[PDB]
């Protein structure tokens, strides 16, 4: 139909998506949203819907979670990161349901990644691989693992949650997580074990 109708449909869909992302999904009309997506993709305007979804998701991420992580980089930084990841996943569940009904045509014909993969990629680009968040996360994980190796006990399930989050963020396998985690961790372990062996060869014997 006319551009005004599709523009209004997209505007209301964007408002509903933003409301869902704001932890206010209690009154989400699934039937209405599914019908608007049907009448939107039916008229061969999937490119505009995909671009708008990407723009809305990246704007929401940069506005909310990029500020939240940087505001709490020292007070439960990893806990806040895990909470933000869980919230993003639980919103992207329904987001991916609707836009995966859409994706059955977009991911296939347009030959692009699915909306779940799109959300994972944009999260990786805007939060984990940020110019400041990445180095801070690396430094804090190295510090806590070194302190654990020193002898004192720290939280361990949290590190498992972070590693699982990075593995899921890989989205294809162990390409991003392996590098980002192991390589600084590999260097830290190398230096730590070299120093430990140097101390042990002089402070003890072969017995």
């Amino acid at each position: 139909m006319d551009e005004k109708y599709v523009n209004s449909i997209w505007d209301l869909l964007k408002n509903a998506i933003q409301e869902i992302q704001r932890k206010n999904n209690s009154g989400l009309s699934f039937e209405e949203l599914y019908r608007n997506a049907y009448t939107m993709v039916l008229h061969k305007h999937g490119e505009k819907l995909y671009t708008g979804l990407r723009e809305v998701v990246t704007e929401h991420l940069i506005n909310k979670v990029r500020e939240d992580v940087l505001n709490s980089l020292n007070n439960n930084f990893l806990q806040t990161l895990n909470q933000a990841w869980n919230d993003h996943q639980t919103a992207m569940v329904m987001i991916r349901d609707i836009l995966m009904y859409m994706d059955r045509v977009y991911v296939q014909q347009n030959n692009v990644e699915n909306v779940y993969n799109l959300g994972l990629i944009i999260f990786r680009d805007q939060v984990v691989r940020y110019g400041c968040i990445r180095d801070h996360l690396r430094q804090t994980l190295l510090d806590m693992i070194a302190r654990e190796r020193k002898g004192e006990v720290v939280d361990r399930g949290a590190i498992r949650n972070a590693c699982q989050m990075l593995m899921i963020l890989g989205l294809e396998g162990r390409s991003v997580y392996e590098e980002d985690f192991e390589a600084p961790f590999l260097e830290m372990s190398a230096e730590f074990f070299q120093m430990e062996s140097q101390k042990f060869l002089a402070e003890n014997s072969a017995s």
Partner: protein
């Protein structure tokens, strides 16, 4: 492990019974006031969208009554019953709405079933309609199949009412494609024009786009004057943009112009012993021998027929049982561009070497060892090229073997040893015709003009029959070397009666040569001698038929001179 013997059938039947009795239901679908009580588990396992609808953390998940709109009641009911029993039982009319409702709910299994049903039912008329649907409801298989069917048939019709209402992208894809089955370049031009005359001043930019698409070869004929007659007033830059489409954009020849009249042969001497027989072609003008892919690749003893629209069909045949020759009633059709064979509706009786005759757009299979043990051994069965079904007709008067049948003046004529019967399609009855004075079998006849030319039999018997005169007469004897067994083949070539015969002697090689025959001269003038450097031996059970093919799609048969 999924044990299918006890639990699966019992569980499915008990779920269906619970659905019937309205037991253990917790969700009810409201469809324009109609209530459909059902279960969430079956909807989740069948539909991908219904799963999320009753799971996504929202108000719809905890909602006993859900008001689902934009769905038909009958389609939702049939989807629910298919989910509860596994049987679809789809008709031929409600396929479009069923596919639309299945696409909205993303029910993959029924979506695939409907896709297969639609791709199998692009017969003659819904091609453009289902192509528009293949676009709207994303379906690549359907899109490609409908595109090929359109390129094959719309290029001969180009007047369908549904074709007018098409989106710009689909029309551009259709017109810009090099698969247009048109022997002339003006028909596509006038088709585009009439597509741009009923809707003008609304699609003027798309008018310019289609004008560029049709390209200079048809742009330089009349389009300028017609547009001047039909242009909106006070339009100047449109003239500038229209004048630009004269020089550029790579004027190239099309593909539909290559409809060379050739000869389709079956059951040839296969160089590869793997195949017992092969199907090849000969070019009267290009003097080349082309090859074709075997339809079943293992079954032989098939019959050929060519419709006036230049279509190739294969019916019946026998295939070896391959235990560690059984007869199959399968049907096939030859693709003029893909060089493959798409099967069609099979026959009802397993015939051996059926004789297929086309008349009034219907394919008539006459004789050919139906079942052999019939109470009425002399029967026939025809085909519907539009409805895609087999309809029983009036049976044969007398039972005959090794017979031939042709069509003349929209009437069915079947020839046997000495008798001939004319079948009236309008009244579905057989009328007695003239009887030949010579008893000859193992021969075929050709329908050239208004005269039937029964050639050969056991020889060189030339018995000419005329429908308007209803009499049999002799003309002459074909000049052939003695101490030989000629294999005669009569067929129409370029609106001129000609023959294709091969002579074989003792300790001698076969020779292929076609002669030009004249009606008033009663002589077979030497038209062309087929050189053995291009064509090799064919055999004894080979068949010949006239048809137009594409050289680019087909491949030349490699053989050492």
């Amino acid at each position: 492990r999924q044990i299918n013997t006890e639990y699966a059938v019992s569980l499915l039947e008990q779920l269906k019974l619970f659905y019937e009795q309205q037991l253990f239901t917790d969700i009810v679908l409201i469809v324009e006031g109609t209530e459909f009580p059902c279960h969430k588990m079956v909807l989740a396992t069948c539909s991908s969208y219904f799963r999320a609808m009753f799971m996504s953390g929202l108000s719809e998940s905890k909602q006993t009554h859900v008001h689902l709109r934009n769905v038909d009641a009958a389609t939702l009911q049939i989807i629910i019953t298919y989910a509860y029993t596994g049987n679809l039982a789809m008709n031929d009319s409600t396929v479009e709405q069923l596919y639309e409702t299945a696409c909205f709910l993303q029910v993959e299994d029924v979506l695939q079933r409907c896709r297969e049903y639609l791709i199998k039912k692009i017969n003659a008329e819904n091609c453009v309609r289902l192509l528009s649907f293949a676009d709207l409801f994303s379906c690549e298989e359907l899109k490609q199949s409908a595109k090929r069917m359109v390129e094959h048939k719309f290029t001969a019709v180009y007047h369908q009412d549904a074709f007018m209402q098409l989106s710009h992208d689909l029309l551009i894809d259709i017109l810009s494609s090099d698969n247009l089955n048109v022997e002339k370049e003006e028909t596509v031009r006038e088709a585009a024009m009439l597509w741009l005359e009923y809707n003008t001043e609304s699609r003027s930019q798309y008018l310019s786009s289609v004008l560029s698409q049709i390209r200079i070869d048809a742009l330089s004929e009349v389009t300028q004057r017609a547009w001047f007659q039909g242009l909106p007033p006070n339009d100047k830059s449109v003239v500038v943009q229209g004048l630009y489409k004269s020089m550029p954009k790579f004027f190239k020849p099309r593909l539909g112009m290559t409809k060379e009249e050739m000869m389709i042969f079956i059951e040839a001497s296969s160089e590869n012993p793997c195949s017992l027989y092969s199907s090849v072609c000969y070019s009267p003008q290009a003097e080349k021998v082309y090859k074709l892919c075997s339809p079943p690749a293992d079954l032989h003893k098939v019959g050929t027929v060519v419709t006036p629209d230049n279509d190739i069909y294969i019916a019946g045949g026998q295939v070896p049982l391959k235990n560690t020759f059984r007869t199959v009633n399968c049907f096939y059709w030859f693709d003029a561009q893909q060089n493959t064979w798409f099967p069609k509706t099979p026959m009802l009786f397993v015939r051996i070497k059926p004789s297929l005759v086309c008349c009034e757009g219907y394919i008539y299979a006459i004789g050919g060892d139906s079942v052999g043990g019939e109470l009425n051994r002399r029967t026939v069965e025809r085909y519907d090229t539009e409805k895609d079904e087999w309809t029983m007709v009036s049976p044969l008067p007398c039972a005959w073997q090794w017979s031939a049948a042709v069509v003349v003046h929209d009437c069915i004529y079947v020839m046997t040893l000495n008798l001939m019967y004319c079948y009236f399609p309008r009244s579905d009855s057989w009328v007695e015709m003239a009887m030949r004075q010579t008893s000859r079998s193992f021969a075929s006849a050709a329908a050239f003009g208004d005269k039937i030319f029964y050639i050969g039999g056991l020889s060189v018997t030339v018995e000419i029959y005329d429908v308007n005169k209803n009499e049999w007469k002799m003309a002459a004897n074909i000049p052939a070397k003695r101490y030989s067994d000629p294999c005669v083949r009569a067929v129409v070539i370029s609106n001129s009666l000609c023959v294709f015969m091969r002579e074989t002697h003792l300790n001698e090689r076969a020779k292929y040569v076609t002669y030009q025959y004249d009606l008033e001269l009663d002589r077979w003038s030497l038209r062309q001698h087929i050189s053995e450097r291009v064509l090799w031996d064919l055999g004894r059970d080979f068949r010949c038929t006239v048809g137009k093919l594409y050289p680019s799609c087909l491949e030349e048969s490699p053989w050492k001179p």
